[PDB]
Design a protein around this ligand. Structure first.
Ligand code: GLU
Ligand code: MN
Length: 290
Protein backbone atom coordinates (compact mmCIF):
# COMPACT_ATOMS: atom_id res chain seq x y z
CA UNK A 1 0.00 0.00 0.00
CA UNK A 2 1.53 3.23 -1.26
CA UNK A 3 1.92 6.03 -0.35
CA UNK A 4 3.65 4.55 2.66
CA UNK A 5 4.52 6.41 5.83
CA UNK A 6 7.25 5.13 8.12
CA UNK A 7 7.57 6.85 11.49
CA UNK A 8 11.30 7.02 12.26
CA UNK A 9 12.72 8.70 15.35
CA UNK A 10 9.44 10.56 15.63
CA UNK A 11 9.45 11.77 12.02
CA UNK A 12 6.88 10.68 9.43
CA UNK A 13 8.85 9.69 6.32
CA UNK A 14 6.62 9.23 3.28
CA UNK A 15 7.22 7.26 0.13
CA UNK A 16 5.06 7.49 -2.98
CA UNK A 17 6.57 4.24 -4.23
CA UNK A 18 9.58 2.01 -3.58
CA UNK A 19 12.92 3.86 -3.40
CA UNK A 20 15.15 3.59 -6.49
CA UNK A 21 18.33 5.57 -5.67
CA UNK A 22 19.46 4.52 -2.23
CA UNK A 23 22.76 5.43 -0.57
CA UNK A 24 23.87 2.96 2.11
CA UNK A 25 25.83 4.72 4.85
CA UNK A 26 25.79 1.60 7.07
CA UNK A 27 25.89 -2.16 6.39
CA UNK A 28 22.87 -3.18 8.51
CA UNK A 29 20.21 -2.99 5.73
CA UNK A 30 22.05 -5.33 3.38
CA UNK A 31 21.24 -8.42 5.45
CA UNK A 32 17.52 -7.93 4.77
CA UNK A 33 17.78 -6.30 1.31
CA UNK A 34 19.78 -9.24 -0.11
CA UNK A 35 17.04 -11.67 1.00
CA UNK A 36 14.26 -9.47 -0.41
CA UNK A 37 16.16 -9.21 -3.69
CA UNK A 38 16.26 -5.40 -3.85
CA UNK A 39 19.96 -4.56 -3.94
CA UNK A 40 19.46 -3.06 -7.43
CA UNK A 41 17.82 -0.10 -5.63
CA UNK A 42 21.21 0.86 -4.16
CA UNK A 43 23.23 3.35 -6.24
CA UNK A 44 26.08 4.09 -3.77
CA UNK A 45 27.55 3.01 -0.43
CA UNK A 46 30.01 4.18 2.21
CA UNK A 47 31.81 2.51 5.08
CA UNK A 48 32.68 -1.13 5.67
CA UNK A 49 30.87 -4.09 4.13
CA UNK A 50 32.70 -7.19 5.44
CA UNK A 51 32.29 -10.10 2.99
CA UNK A 52 31.84 -12.45 5.96
CA UNK A 53 28.31 -11.08 6.30
CA UNK A 54 27.05 -12.03 2.86
CA UNK A 55 26.68 -14.61 0.13
CA UNK A 56 29.16 -14.54 -2.80
CA UNK A 57 26.76 -12.91 -5.25
CA UNK A 58 25.88 -10.13 -2.84
CA UNK A 59 29.60 -9.54 -2.30
CA UNK A 60 30.12 -9.29 -6.05
CA UNK A 61 27.18 -6.87 -6.26
CA UNK A 62 28.71 -4.70 -3.54
CA UNK A 63 32.05 -4.59 -5.41
CA UNK A 64 30.12 -3.04 -8.34
CA UNK A 65 28.32 -0.46 -6.13
CA UNK A 66 30.63 2.58 -6.00
CA UNK A 67 31.78 3.96 -2.66
CA UNK A 68 31.75 7.51 -1.21
CA UNK A 69 34.39 6.58 1.33
CA UNK A 70 35.69 3.99 3.76
CA UNK A 71 37.45 6.08 6.43
CA UNK A 72 36.38 5.02 9.93
CA UNK A 73 37.51 6.48 13.27
CA UNK A 74 38.70 4.36 16.20
CA UNK A 75 35.07 3.73 17.20
CA UNK A 76 34.14 2.43 13.74
CA UNK A 77 32.37 5.63 12.70
CA UNK A 78 32.25 6.66 9.08
CA UNK A 79 33.72 10.03 8.18
CA UNK A 80 31.68 11.63 5.37
CA UNK A 81 30.23 15.04 4.50
CA UNK A 82 26.60 15.94 3.96
CA UNK A 83 27.57 17.87 0.80
CA UNK A 84 29.10 14.73 -0.78
CA UNK A 85 25.82 12.92 -0.13
CA UNK A 86 23.57 15.65 -1.47
CA UNK A 87 25.69 15.94 -4.62
CA UNK A 88 24.64 12.41 -5.63
CA UNK A 89 20.88 13.24 -5.73
CA UNK A 90 19.73 10.12 -3.85
CA UNK A 91 16.06 9.51 -3.09
CA UNK A 92 16.76 7.71 0.19
CA UNK A 93 19.73 7.63 2.60
CA UNK A 94 20.07 4.79 5.10
CA UNK A 95 22.05 5.76 8.17
CA UNK A 96 23.23 9.11 9.53
CA UNK A 97 26.97 9.27 10.09
CA UNK A 98 28.47 11.83 12.47
CA UNK A 99 27.77 15.35 11.29
CA UNK A 100 25.27 14.30 8.61
CA UNK A 101 21.84 15.63 9.58
CA UNK A 102 18.31 14.52 8.78
CA UNK A 103 17.28 18.15 8.40
CA UNK A 104 19.99 18.97 5.87
CA UNK A 105 18.98 16.06 3.69
CA UNK A 106 15.22 16.47 4.09
CA UNK A 107 15.52 20.18 3.17
CA UNK A 108 16.46 19.20 -0.39
CA UNK A 109 13.90 16.42 -0.75
CA UNK A 110 15.94 13.37 0.31
CA UNK A 111 14.25 10.81 2.58
CA UNK A 112 16.20 9.55 5.56
CA UNK A 113 15.85 6.32 7.61
CA UNK A 114 17.87 5.33 10.66
CA UNK A 115 17.72 1.90 12.35
CA UNK A 116 15.02 2.41 15.00
CA UNK A 117 17.11 1.43 17.99
CA UNK A 118 19.78 3.93 16.89
CA UNK A 119 17.39 6.86 17.15
CA UNK A 120 18.60 9.47 19.60
CA UNK A 121 17.09 9.45 23.06
CA UNK A 122 15.48 6.50 24.77
CA UNK A 123 14.22 3.63 22.62
CA UNK A 124 13.28 1.10 25.32
CA UNK A 125 14.69 -2.38 25.91
CA UNK A 126 15.43 -4.19 22.68
CA UNK A 127 14.12 -7.64 21.82
CA UNK A 128 14.13 -9.98 18.83
CA UNK A 129 10.77 -8.38 17.88
CA UNK A 130 12.89 -5.37 16.83
CA UNK A 131 14.56 -7.59 14.20
CA UNK A 132 11.22 -8.76 12.84
CA UNK A 133 9.53 -5.38 12.86
CA UNK A 134 12.32 -3.82 10.82
CA UNK A 135 12.17 -6.68 8.27
CA UNK A 136 8.41 -6.16 7.95
CA UNK A 137 9.01 -2.43 7.40
CA UNK A 138 11.47 -3.19 4.58
CA UNK A 139 8.84 -5.55 3.17
CA UNK A 140 6.40 -2.63 2.89
CA UNK A 141 9.02 -0.17 1.64
CA UNK A 142 10.15 -2.41 -1.20
CA UNK A 143 6.76 -4.09 -1.90
CA UNK A 144 8.20 -7.48 -0.94
CA UNK A 145 5.84 -8.28 1.93
CA UNK A 146 5.52 -12.00 1.25
CA UNK A 147 9.30 -12.43 1.09
CA UNK A 148 9.70 -10.38 4.28
CA UNK A 149 7.16 -12.58 6.09
CA UNK A 150 9.04 -15.75 5.03
CA UNK A 151 12.32 -14.25 6.31
CA UNK A 152 10.75 -13.42 9.67
CA UNK A 153 9.31 -16.94 9.96
CA UNK A 154 12.70 -18.53 9.18
CA UNK A 155 14.48 -16.33 11.74
CA UNK A 156 11.84 -16.90 14.45
CA UNK A 157 12.26 -20.64 14.01
CA UNK A 158 16.05 -20.41 14.43
CA UNK A 159 15.76 -18.28 17.55
CA UNK A 160 13.20 -20.71 18.99
CA UNK A 161 15.62 -23.59 18.40
CA UNK A 162 18.39 -21.89 20.41
CA UNK A 163 15.99 -20.91 23.22
CA UNK A 164 14.63 -24.47 23.36
CA UNK A 165 18.18 -25.89 23.65
CA UNK A 166 18.89 -23.38 26.40
CA UNK A 167 15.66 -24.34 28.21
CA UNK A 168 17.10 -27.85 28.43
CA UNK A 169 23.14 -18.77 34.62
CA UNK A 170 26.53 -17.44 33.55
CA UNK A 171 27.03 -13.68 33.18
CA UNK A 172 28.19 -11.91 30.06
CA UNK A 173 28.96 -8.55 28.49
CA UNK A 174 29.30 -7.30 24.98
CA UNK A 175 32.03 -4.69 24.39
CA UNK A 176 33.39 -2.61 21.56
CA UNK A 177 37.14 -2.34 22.29
CA UNK A 178 39.47 0.49 21.28
CA UNK A 179 42.33 -0.71 19.07
CA UNK A 180 45.72 0.04 20.59
CA UNK A 181 44.25 -0.65 24.02
CA UNK A 182 41.03 -0.15 25.94
CA UNK A 183 37.76 -1.92 26.73
CA UNK A 184 36.18 1.08 25.01
CA UNK A 185 32.39 0.73 25.15
CA UNK A 186 29.79 -1.67 26.55
CA UNK A 187 26.23 -2.44 25.45
CA UNK A 188 23.16 -1.91 27.59
CA UNK A 189 19.54 -3.03 27.34
CA UNK A 190 18.74 -0.85 24.29
CA UNK A 191 21.33 -2.82 22.30
CA UNK A 192 20.62 -5.99 20.36
CA UNK A 193 23.40 -7.45 22.58
CA UNK A 194 20.97 -7.59 25.45
CA UNK A 195 18.29 -9.95 24.04
CA UNK A 196 21.00 -11.88 22.18
CA UNK A 197 22.78 -12.67 25.44
CA UNK A 198 19.56 -13.48 27.27
CA UNK A 199 18.26 -15.79 24.49
CA UNK A 200 21.58 -17.63 24.69
CA UNK A 201 20.98 -18.18 28.41
CA UNK A 202 23.25 -15.53 29.91
CA UNK A 203 22.70 -12.73 32.32
CA UNK A 204 23.72 -9.42 30.77
CA UNK A 205 25.74 -7.61 33.44
CA UNK A 206 24.50 -4.33 31.94
CA UNK A 207 20.85 -5.36 31.75
CA UNK A 208 19.94 -2.43 34.02
CA UNK A 209 21.66 0.23 31.93
CA UNK A 210 18.98 2.02 29.88
CA UNK A 211 21.39 2.89 27.09
CA UNK A 212 22.40 1.32 23.82
CA UNK A 213 26.16 1.83 24.04
CA UNK A 214 28.25 3.64 26.64
CA UNK A 215 31.91 4.21 27.55
CA UNK A 216 33.55 1.90 30.08
CA UNK A 217 36.90 1.66 31.83
CA UNK A 218 38.60 -1.64 32.64
CA UNK A 219 37.73 -0.96 36.26
CA UNK A 220 34.05 -0.83 35.25
CA UNK A 221 34.22 -4.21 33.54
CA UNK A 222 36.24 -5.67 36.43
CA UNK A 223 33.51 -4.71 38.91
CA UNK A 224 31.00 -6.71 36.87
CA UNK A 225 33.52 -9.49 36.06
CA UNK A 226 31.36 -11.25 33.49
CA UNK A 227 31.93 -14.97 32.94
CA UNK A 228 31.96 -14.42 29.17
CA UNK A 229 32.86 -11.55 26.82
CA UNK A 230 31.77 -10.84 23.26
CA UNK A 231 33.98 -8.25 21.51
CA UNK A 232 32.64 -6.41 18.47
CA UNK A 233 34.46 -4.58 15.70
CA UNK A 234 33.29 -2.94 12.45
CA UNK A 235 36.31 -4.22 10.50
CA UNK A 236 40.05 -4.83 10.76
CA UNK A 237 42.03 -7.55 12.48
CA UNK A 238 40.21 -9.47 15.21
CA UNK A 239 43.52 -10.29 16.93
CA UNK A 240 44.05 -6.59 17.59
CA UNK A 241 40.50 -6.36 18.94
CA UNK A 242 41.10 -9.14 21.48
CA UNK A 243 44.55 -7.67 22.34
CA UNK A 244 42.91 -4.32 23.11
CA UNK A 245 41.35 -6.07 26.12
CA UNK A 246 43.56 -8.99 27.12
CA UNK A 247 46.91 -7.14 26.94
CA UNK A 248 45.70 -4.29 29.18
CA UNK A 249 47.47 -4.01 32.54
CA UNK A 250 45.34 -5.78 35.14
CA UNK A 251 43.10 -7.49 32.58
CA UNK A 252 44.05 -10.92 33.92
CA UNK A 253 41.84 -10.14 36.90
CA UNK A 254 38.92 -10.80 34.53
CA UNK A 255 37.43 -14.28 34.79
CA UNK A 256 36.70 -14.16 31.07
CA UNK A 257 40.31 -13.36 30.25
CA UNK A 258 41.73 -16.07 32.55
CA UNK A 259 39.36 -18.71 31.16
CA UNK A 260 39.71 -17.30 27.61
CA UNK A 261 35.94 -17.20 27.38
CA UNK A 262 36.06 -14.49 24.71
CA UNK A 263 34.35 -14.31 21.33
CA UNK A 264 35.40 -11.72 18.76
CA UNK A 265 32.92 -11.07 15.98
CA UNK A 266 32.05 -8.47 13.41
CA UNK A 267 29.65 -5.74 14.51
CA UNK A 268 26.45 -6.78 12.69
CA UNK A 269 26.54 -10.29 14.14
CA UNK A 270 25.18 -8.46 17.17
CA UNK A 271 24.23 -4.81 16.55
CA UNK A 272 21.82 -3.37 15.33
CA UNK A 273 18.76 -5.67 15.09
CA UNK A 274 19.05 -7.50 11.74
CA UNK A 275 18.95 -11.05 10.39
CA UNK A 276 22.67 -11.27 11.21
CA UNK A 277 21.78 -10.94 14.91
CA UNK A 278 20.32 -14.44 14.64
CA UNK A 279 23.62 -15.72 13.18
CA UNK A 280 25.35 -14.11 16.15
CA UNK A 281 22.95 -15.77 18.58
CA UNK A 282 23.81 -19.16 17.09
CA UNK A 283 27.53 -18.36 17.21
CA UNK A 284 27.39 -17.38 20.89
CA UNK A 285 25.31 -20.48 21.72
CA UNK A 286 27.65 -22.85 19.87
CA UNK A 287 30.81 -21.22 21.29
CA UNK A 288 29.91 -21.07 24.96
CA UNK A 289 27.37 -23.91 24.85
CA UNK A 290 24.34 -24.11 27.13
N1 GLU B 1 30.07 1.70 16.23
C1 GLU B 1 29.77 1.22 17.60
C2 GLU B 1 30.62 2.02 18.62
C3 GLU B 1 29.91 2.67 19.82
C4 GLU B 1 29.55 4.13 19.58
O1 GLU B 1 28.66 4.41 18.76
O2 GLU B 1 30.16 5.00 20.24
C5 GLU B 1 28.25 1.28 17.87
O3 GLU B 1 27.46 1.97 17.21
O4 GLU B 1 27.72 0.58 18.71
MN1 MN C 1 28.55 3.69 16.76
Amino acid sequence: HFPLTITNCGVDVTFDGPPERIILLESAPVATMRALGVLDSVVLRAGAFPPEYYDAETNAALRAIPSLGEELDSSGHLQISEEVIIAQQPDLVLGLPDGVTREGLEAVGINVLVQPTMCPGGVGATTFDDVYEQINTYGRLFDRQDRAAELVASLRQRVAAVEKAVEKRRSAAVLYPTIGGGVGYAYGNESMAHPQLESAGFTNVYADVDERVFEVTLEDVLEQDPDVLVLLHVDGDPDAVKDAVVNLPGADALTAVRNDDILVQLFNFTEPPTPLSVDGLERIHETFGA
